[PDB]
Design a protein around this ligand. Structure first.
Ligand code: PC1
Lengths: 80, 70
């Protein structure tokens, strides 16, 4: 496959470069470690209003104040 | 007598062949320079885009805090 690659690199290097960039752009995001970081970065953007919920008295996760430790934090993007 | 004559020693050598210099770096050098510039730009854009996302999140949470009075 080396002779064929040398031949196409000698004839038209633009096609070889374009196909190399296309293959890199295809196979690298499937091997990327920061794609899930992009997922939570997009998911953590506060576009609309975070409306509260009614209380039946049984909820261990949601807080009553924004500064309470209960609830999700955003420390991972602050450090990164 | 006096007449138009070349001198006693004659005229000097005159260059008449092609002389191209042949100059610049090797192609590996410009390829490495371009790749390094690409990597540096990618890193700087990465850092500044992350900072911009943080600032946008801060502005959005300020907007969310300001909403109920409006
Ligand atoms: C905007 C900022 C300033 C820009 C520079 C301004 C000053 C310099 C201006 C120079 C003169 C420009 C006008 C005259 C020329 C007009 C014609 C022209 O441009 O023809 C285009 C010429 C035409 O080529 P050609 O004329 O040789 O065509 C012959 C074609 N074959 C060989 C098939 C017979 O080149 C191209 O079309 C190539 C496009 C640009 C390539 C850029 C490559 C960037 C790096 C890619 C990756 C490389 C690494 C390897 C892969 C790695 C993968 C991970």
């Amino acid at each position: 496959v080396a002779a064929f690659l040398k031949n196409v690199w000698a004839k038209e290097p633009v096609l070889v470069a374009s196909f190399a960039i296309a293959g890199l752009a295809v196979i690298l995001p499937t091997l990327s470690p920061y794609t899930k970081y992009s997922l939570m970065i997009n998911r953590a953007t506060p576009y609309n209003y975070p409306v509260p919920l009614r209380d039946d008295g049984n909820m261990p996760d949601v807080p009553s104040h924004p500064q309470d430790p209960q609830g999700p934090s955003l420390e991972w993007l602050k450090r990164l | 007598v006096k007449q138009d004559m070349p001198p006693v020693g004659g005229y000097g050598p005159i260059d008449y062949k092609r002389n191209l210099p042949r100059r610049g770096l090797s192609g590996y050098s410009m390829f490495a320079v371009g790749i390094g510039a690409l990597l540096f730009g990618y890193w700087s854009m990465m850092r500044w885009n992350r900072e911009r996302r943080r600032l946008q999140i801060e502005d959005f949470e300020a907007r969310i805090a300001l909403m109920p009075l409006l």
